[PDB]
Design a protein around this motif. Structure first.
Motif, PDB file in Angstrom:
ATOM      1  N   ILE A 198       0.858  -1.170   0.000  1.00  0.00           N
ATOM      2  CA  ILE A 198       0.000   0.000   0.000  1.00  0.00           C
ATOM      3  C   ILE A 198       0.898   1.224   0.000  1.00  0.00           C
ATOM      4  O   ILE A 198       1.701   1.425   0.913  1.00  0.00           O
ATOM      5  N   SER A 199       0.759   2.040  -1.035  1.00  0.00           N
ATOM      6  CA  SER A 199       1.589   3.221  -1.190  1.00  0.00           C
ATOM      7  C   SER A 199       0.842   4.546  -1.255  1.00  0.00           C
ATOM      8  O   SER A 199      -0.243   4.640  -1.828  1.00  0.00           O
ATOM      9  N   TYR A 200       1.440   5.566  -0.645  1.00  0.00           N
ATOM     10  CA  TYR A 200       0.888   6.911  -0.686  1.00  0.00           C
ATOM     11  C   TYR A 200       1.925   7.774  -1.395  1.00  0.00           C
ATOM     12  O   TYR A 200       3.007   8.028  -0.857  1.00  0.00           O
ATOM     13  N   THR A 201       1.592   8.222  -2.597  1.00  0.00           N
ATOM     14  CA  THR A 201       2.503   9.046  -3.373  1.00  0.00           C
ATOM     15  C   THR A 201       2.122  10.518  -3.341  1.00  0.00           C
ATOM     16  O   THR A 201       1.046  10.900  -3.811  1.00  0.00           O
ATOM     17  N   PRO A 202       2.990  11.362  -2.763  1.00  0.00           N
ATOM     18  CA  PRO A 202       2.701  12.795  -2.709  1.00  0.00           C
ATOM     19  C   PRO A 202       2.765  13.306  -4.148  1.00  0.00           C
ATOM     20  O   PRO A 202       3.431  12.709  -4.995  1.00  0.00           O
ATOM     21  N   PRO A 203       2.071  14.411  -4.451  1.00  0.00           N
ATOM     22  CA  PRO A 203       2.074  14.967  -5.806  1.00  0.00           C
ATOM     23  C   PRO A 203       3.378  15.650  -6.221  1.00  0.00           C
ATOM     24  O   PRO A 203       4.351  15.687  -5.461  1.00  0.00           O
ATOM     25  N   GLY A 204       3.387  16.188  -7.440  1.00  0.00           N
ATOM     26  CA  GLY A 204       4.566  16.867  -7.944  1.00  0.00           C
ATOM     27  C   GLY A 204       5.192  16.176  -9.142  1.00  0.00           C
ATOM     28  O   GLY A 204       5.675  16.839 -10.066  1.00  0.00           O
ATOM     29  N   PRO A 239       2.149   7.379  -9.669  1.00  0.00           N
ATOM     30  CA  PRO A 239       3.181   6.350  -9.857  1.00  0.00           C
ATOM     31  C   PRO A 239       2.750   5.353 -10.930  1.00  0.00           C
ATOM     32  O   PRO A 239       1.654   4.791 -10.865  1.00  0.00           O
ATOM     33  N   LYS A 240       3.614   5.135 -11.914  1.00  0.00           N
ATOM     34  CA  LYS A 240       3.298   4.236 -13.018  1.00  0.00           C
ATOM     35  C   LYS A 240       3.723   2.789 -12.831  1.00  0.00           C
ATOM     36  O   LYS A 240       3.196   1.893 -13.496  1.00  0.00           O
ATOM     37  N   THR A 241       4.665   2.555 -11.926  1.00  0.00           N
ATOM     38  CA  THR A 241       5.150   1.201 -11.682  1.00  0.00           C
ATOM     39  C   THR A 241       5.321   0.945 -10.195  1.00  0.00           C
ATOM     40  O   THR A 241       5.238   1.868  -9.385  1.00  0.00           O
ATOM     41  N   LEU A 242       5.559  -0.312  -9.840  1.00  0.00           N
ATOM     42  CA  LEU A 242       5.771  -0.672  -8.445  1.00  0.00           C
ATOM     43  C   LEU A 242       7.057   0.018  -7.987  1.00  0.00           C
ATOM     44  O   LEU A 242       7.164   0.445  -6.838  1.00  0.00           O
ATOM     45  N   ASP A 243       8.026   0.127  -8.897  1.00  0.00           N
ATOM     46  CA  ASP A 243       9.292   0.781  -8.587  1.00  0.00           C
ATOM     47  C   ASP A 243       9.053   2.216  -8.139  1.00  0.00           C
ATOM     48  O   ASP A 243       9.711   2.702  -7.223  1.00  0.00           O
ATOM     49  N   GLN A 244       8.118   2.893  -8.787  1.00  0.00           N
ATOM     50  CA  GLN A 244       7.812   4.273  -8.429  1.00  0.00           C
ATOM     51  C   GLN A 244       6.989   4.356  -7.151  1.00  0.00           C
ATOM     52  O   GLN A 244       7.245   5.202  -6.298  1.00  0.00           O
ATOM     53  N   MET A 253       6.834   2.280  -4.573  1.00  0.00           N
ATOM     54  CA  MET A 253       7.601   1.954  -3.376  1.00  0.00           C
ATOM     55  C   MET A 253       8.684   2.986  -3.057  1.00  0.00           C
ATOM     56  O   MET A 253       9.442   2.831  -2.098  1.00  0.00           O
ATOM     57  N   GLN A 254       8.742   4.047  -3.852  1.00  0.00           N
ATOM     58  CA  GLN A 254       9.724   5.103  -3.632  1.00  0.00           C
ATOM     59  C   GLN A 254       9.108   6.194  -2.767  1.00  0.00           C
ATOM     60  O   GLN A 254       9.800   7.115  -2.321  1.00  0.00           O
ATOM     61  N   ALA A 255       7.801   6.080  -2.546  1.00  0.00           N
ATOM     62  CA  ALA A 255       7.048   7.021  -1.725  1.00  0.00           C
ATOM     63  C   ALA A 255       6.690   6.319  -0.414  1.00  0.00           C
ATOM     64  O   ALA A 255       7.229   5.260  -0.097  1.00  0.00           O
ATOM     65  N   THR A 256       5.771   6.910   0.348  1.00  0.00           N
ATOM     66  CA  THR A 256       5.354   6.319   1.613  1.00  0.00           C
ATOM     67  C   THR A 256       4.584   5.031   1.368  1.00  0.00           C
ATOM     68  O   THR A 256       3.609   5.020   0.618  1.00  0.00           O
ATOM     69  N   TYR A 257       5.017   3.941   1.992  1.00  0.00           N
ATOM     70  CA  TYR A 257       4.306   2.684   1.815  1.00  0.00           C
ATOM     71  C   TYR A 257       4.465   1.718   2.977  1.00  0.00           C
ATOM     72  O   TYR A 257       5.373   1.844   3.798  1.00  0.00           O
ATOM     73  N   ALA A 258       3.562   0.750   3.022  1.00  0.00           N
ATOM     74  CA  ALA A 258       3.559  -0.287   4.041  1.00  0.00           C
ATOM     75  C   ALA A 258       3.219  -1.589   3.336  1.00  0.00           C
ATOM     76  O   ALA A 258       2.381  -1.609   2.436  1.00  0.00           O
ATOM     77  N   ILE A 259       3.883  -2.670   3.724  1.00  0.00           N
ATOM     78  CA  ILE A 259       3.615  -3.966   3.131  1.00  0.00           C
ATOM     79  C   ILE A 259       2.623  -4.687   4.028  1.00  0.00           C
ATOM     80  O   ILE A 259       2.866  -4.867   5.219  1.00  0.00           O
ATOM     81  N   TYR A 294      14.636   2.436   1.897  1.00  0.00           N
ATOM     82  CA  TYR A 294      14.596   1.116   1.285  1.00  0.00           C
ATOM     83  C   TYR A 294      14.233   1.232  -0.188  1.00  0.00           C
ATOM     84  O   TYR A 294      13.244   1.878  -0.545  1.00  0.00           O
ATOM     85  N   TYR A 295      15.039   0.613  -1.039  1.00  0.00           N
ATOM     86  CA  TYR A 295      14.782   0.602  -2.473  1.00  0.00           C
ATOM     87  C   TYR A 295      14.361  -0.838  -2.770  1.00  0.00           C
ATOM     88  O   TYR A 295      15.143  -1.771  -2.583  1.00  0.00           O
ATOM     89  N   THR A 296      13.117  -1.018  -3.202  1.00  0.00           N
ATOM     90  CA  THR A 296      12.594  -2.351  -3.479  1.00  0.00           C
ATOM     91  C   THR A 296      12.601  -2.712  -4.960  1.00  0.00           C
ATOM     92  O   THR A 296      12.167  -1.929  -5.804  1.00  0.00           O
ATOM     93  N   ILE A 297      13.095  -3.911  -5.265  1.00  0.00           N
ATOM     94  CA  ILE A 297      13.176  -4.389  -6.642  1.00  0.00           C
ATOM     95  C   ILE A 297      12.847  -5.878  -6.757  1.00  0.00           C
ATOM     96  O   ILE A 297      13.086  -6.650  -5.825  1.00  0.00           O
ATOM     97  N   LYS A 298      12.294  -6.272  -7.900  1.00  0.00           N
ATOM     98  CA  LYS A 298      11.965  -7.674  -8.147  1.00  0.00           C
ATOM     99  C   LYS A 298      13.280  -8.348  -8.527  1.00  0.00           C
ATOM    100  O   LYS A 298      14.088  -7.766  -9.255  1.00  0.00           O
TER     101      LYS A 298
END
Lengths: 219, 258, 189, 219, 258
Positions: free
Chosen positions: C84-90, C94-99, C101-107, E52-56
């Motif tokens: 679960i991710s929360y992406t601040p604007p600007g 986010p287009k991918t999981l990579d993007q 998970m670069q913001a606020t998130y919890a698994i 943390y940088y997450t990757i597959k």
């Protein structure tokens, strides 16, 4: 308390008879010359002599399918009353819709008290003023075409139902299911020429039992 | 573990092994005080009436949708013969004041999915909505026999014919179920619990109730998430409830109602 | 009235037939796109019928945490993990999981406990934010909350492939509203 | 604080509809029946429903090349505002341009709040008064044809730009460059017959960052 | 239970519900002290880089055998665009010194079998072994795209043609995987945990690293017991990882590398 402590349009009144005459219940294009003091929808119900609390809102026009509605109510209260019961005092404001010098007499009748729609006991006097009930009389070019006052909660009920009342009001359960007995703040009868808009202000407002708000169409 | 709970009431006792605790509506309990609006000394502390009355409520199938519900008018749901001494005493009294202690039951399995919202609501419309007919004494306070759909109550339900309904946008018996969670409640999540425990005090427009004319409390079971399960899993999923009138006090003794 | 705002209420997700339901589906696969996307605005059509939004509609501004509650309704035999991710604007959505998970998130890992209480931190250039708007501005729209499938929902035979996750929202512990107002009127239906 | 603490003509309003009617945005020879509360130039911009803040001043006449201007503003503020930002409360005065007895209703809408240009919810009532927003109602031969009141700074901005705002107001930078978002003190909607002049008085005025004054032609 | 663990790092947070604890390699942590080999005051405490940088990483199938593995060169695995501010700062600095906090993820079910060895190793050969070609800047520090077989590394892998290989019995890049367990590690046993948590300090032949020429640390995931499952069970089993550079310090600011 703060949120509801402000005046909101809640009713409209109309009279075509002069001050010094006998008050007689009348309707004209969905406007009576008396009002039932309640934020909930009220209107003449099944040819009742005076307005009673309604259970639903109807459009004034049989065609348009658009407001105004023929029923009187505080739209802001109906659209936002997230509670089952409420308690408060009522500050009422009555304003003349045009600048013609006012000359009117208003009679306030406590919740459930006799309406006393009697004849004049003396010639050329406003029958509405022929009472000990609280009444107001405003007239002249020194006035500012309005009236305001505050009345206490007068219902025999401890708290008033804000939306629905799941029951009947009489022992033979023949009344209109959904309407509580004496769930109002009384009535306002008016005589004198003019159309007057009414506002309600809920003083020392207290609410009980959270409940759903009116549904809004999905954008 | 700490989820095993037993509750005694008279000669009855409920037991659960998946409780999530008991929720007290308004953080209040009916203390059983006599109504100050009655001069006659009330009849109270009737052990034979202070117990759990258990009844079957409904069958949950895959066809139910979110917000479809079952209503249980109180005290009426127990004013019948199956209401035991609570009923026989109630029917012979003009007034009754009491709270409610309730546990609704419903089990499935680790392989079933779905959830219900169990709540108590004061002045919750219990009238029949499958007609434009005025509610009557024998049709207004009955436990739902079938699941109620949800669409027809968002803006209320006027007891007027279908063509007039068009000019009636809102009725005072409206229920915005999207906020039904604001009522004292609990959730019966099949993966978590098989029981919900609630209790509410006495609330009403007056000190005590002329119950014959008013069902002030309503127990409601609504589905939040539809029932799901795969081929082979038990298909019969039923809902039950144990209802206990909390310290009921009666006033105005008279001949029975019929 | 804040009491009401804090009661978790249902979000309206879209069914395959564009019908509104209180949950979303997940199965034995990990999509390259989010399962659901909620724009953080008390104006989101997604939370339009939640008590939170119902109350917020009558106020001008808010401040504080938002709680997004997810309840897993799949079988007890079903497992899986969500991000679960929360992406601040600007920088946009986010287009991918990579993007994401670069913001606020919890698994969120499934198991004994059924639900996950996720908080969208109040990250804003202003102390208060608007409840609604004509056009989105930097004071009325605050980013997105997206839930991704980290690992596929996994299960044994005899278990339906689709699991339903209930979705709810409410104001957090430090959530507040202010300035009583009337919302844009509409005709019930 | 002292210099700006005095009333200066800053706007003019005109209405041809009565009190008891539905308010409807209108323009007549460059005069609307609603106002945007800001000392800077304001007017209908590119057919906007209500007046918005302008970026320049134009003559009312297409020929004369002489004032009046079609845009509303506090000339004294525009001609002399040697600062980049300002902060203050606003004392507004509204005066009827002739001696005919006044009968008007004014609605004040806080900076950026909903205008609520809806229909009347009840027959023969001023729709502008059908709100909890601060509103004023003056009528009768006892009145003196004017209204005055003070409102607090309501903009979401800390300080307001006094002349120019070197930027856009939206995230796709499509707005009118030069105009700040919500840089005003709200709006005034009016209903009832008459033309009314408006004055602004800057209470507890505070200014920041000295900057050039409007250039004056060389004598 | 006590196996629920959350770990925050900047604007990121990992969560697991089957942790077996965090293993600290050498019982040490990178404290973030500036390298005494640099006069310029280092750039450090960059919150946007301490996350943390997450990757597959890879898909685990039944075809993988014991000791088949995936390698993740550090810091290179995160020197790309997806390395966020850690990357953009790293690319513009001559030297970098840091430790690693890592969690590799992989779930299956109570009906699946198999295990992985998750470990960190310093100076662990990350070069390509599917060729006799000399490793280059763009082929030596890449995250494995395919599982690496195990046989060809026991005695090392010389970058010489197949016929010469015959007279070359041992290469210094040899890895006796039978002892890979001597490296700071943890085991991901499908029946026990779905995550492994490790952390290692900074080690190298010198105070700080000229990272452009050296990948001192390598995260390695090797299967210990082959994946097994019966017909009907989920077939897609994937491995992921959350990598956090611990208190990285940078020296020698310059224009970026390409």
């Amino acid at each position: 308390s703060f949120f509801y402590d402000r005046s909101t349009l809640s009713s409209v009144l109309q009279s075509t008879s002069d001050v010094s005459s006998k008050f007689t219940p009348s309707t004209a294009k969905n406007l009576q010359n008396s009002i039932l003091l309640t934020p909930l929808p009220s209107d003449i119900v099944n040819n009742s002599v005076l307005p009673e609390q309604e259970r639903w809102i109807s459009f004034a026009s049989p065609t348009t399918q658009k407001p105004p509605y023929k029923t009187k109510q505080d739209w802001n209260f109906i659209m936002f009353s997230p509670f089952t019961y409420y308690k408060c005092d009522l500050e009422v404001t009555l304003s003349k819709n045009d600048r013609e010098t006012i000359s009117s007499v208003v009679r306030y009748v406590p919740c459930g008290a006799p309406s006393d729609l009697s004849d004049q006991t003396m010639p050329q006097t406003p029958s509405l003023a022929d009472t000990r009930d609280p009444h107001m009389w405003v007239v002249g070019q020194g006035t500012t075409n309005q009236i305001s006052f505050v009345i206490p909660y007068t219902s025999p009920l401890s708290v008033l139902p804000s939306v629905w009342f799941n029951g009947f009001s009489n022992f033979d359960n023949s009344s209109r299911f959904g309407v509580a007995p004496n769930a109002d703040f009384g009535r306002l009868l008016l005589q004198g020429q003019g159309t007057f808009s009414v506002h309600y202000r809920y003083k020392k407002m207290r609410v009980f039992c959270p409940r759903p708000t009116v549904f809004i169409p999905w954008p | 573990s700490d989820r095993v709970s037993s509750d005694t009431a008279g000669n009855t006792a409920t037991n659960t092994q998946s409780t999530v605790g008991r929720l007290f509506g308004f953080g209040q309990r009916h203390k059983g005080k006599h109504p100050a609006s009655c001069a006659d000394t009330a009849t109270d502390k009737v052990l034979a009436a202070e117990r759990y009355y258990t009844i079957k409520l409904a069958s949950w199938t895959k066809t139910q949708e979110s917000f479809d519900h079952i209503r249980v008018p109180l005290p009426h749901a127990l004013a019948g013969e199956n209401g035991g001494v609570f009923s026989s005493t109630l029917r012979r009294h003009y007034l009754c004041k009491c709270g409610w202690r309730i546990q609704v039951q419903c089990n499935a399995s680790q392989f079933h999915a779905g959830s219900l919202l169990v709540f108590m609501a004061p002045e919750f419309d219990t009238s029949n909505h499958s007609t434009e007919v005025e509610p009557r004494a024998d049709t207004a306070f009955k436990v739902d026999a079938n699941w109620q759909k949800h669409a027809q109550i968002l803006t209320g339900h006027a007891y007027v014919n279908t063509t007039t309904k068009v000019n009636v946008p809102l009725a005072l018996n409206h229920q915005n179920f999207w906020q039904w969670t604001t009522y004292p409640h609990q959730i019966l999540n099949l993966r978590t619990n098989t029981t919900c425990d609630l209790e509410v005090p006495y609330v009403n427009v007056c000190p005590t109730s002329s119950w014959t004319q008013h069902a002030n409390w309503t127990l409601v079971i609504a589905v939040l998430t539809p029932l799901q399960y795969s081929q082979g899993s038990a298909t019969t999923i039923e809902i039950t409830a144990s209802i206990q009138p909390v310290k009921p006090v009666f006033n105005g003794l008279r001949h029975t109602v019929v | 009235l804040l009491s009401l705002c804090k009661i978790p209420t249902f979000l309206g997700n879209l069914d395959s037939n564009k019908k509104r339901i209180p949950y979303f589906s997940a199965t034995n696969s990990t999509p390259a796109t989010p399962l659901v996307t909620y724009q953080v605005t008390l104006s989101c059509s997604c939370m339009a019928n939640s008590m939170l939004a119902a109350v917020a509609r009558n106020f001008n501004q808010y401040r504080g945490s938002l709680n997004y509650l997810f309840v897993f309704t799949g079988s007890a035999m079903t497992k899986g993990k969500f991000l679960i991710s929360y992406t601040p604007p600007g920088a946009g959505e986010p287009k991918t999981l990579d993007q994401a998970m670069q913001a606020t998130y919890a698994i969120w890992d499934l198991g004994l406990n059924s639900s996950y209480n996720f908080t969208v931190p109040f990250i804003s250039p202003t102390h208060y934010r608007q409840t609604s708007y004509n056009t989105p501005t930097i004071t009325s729209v605050d980013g997105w909350l997206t839930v991704w499938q980290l690992t596929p929902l996994t299960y044994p035979l005899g278990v339906p492939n689709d699991s339903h996750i209930l979705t709810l929202v409410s104001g957090g512990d430090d959530f507040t509203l202010r300035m009583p107002v009337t919302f844009t009127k509409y005709v019930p239906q």
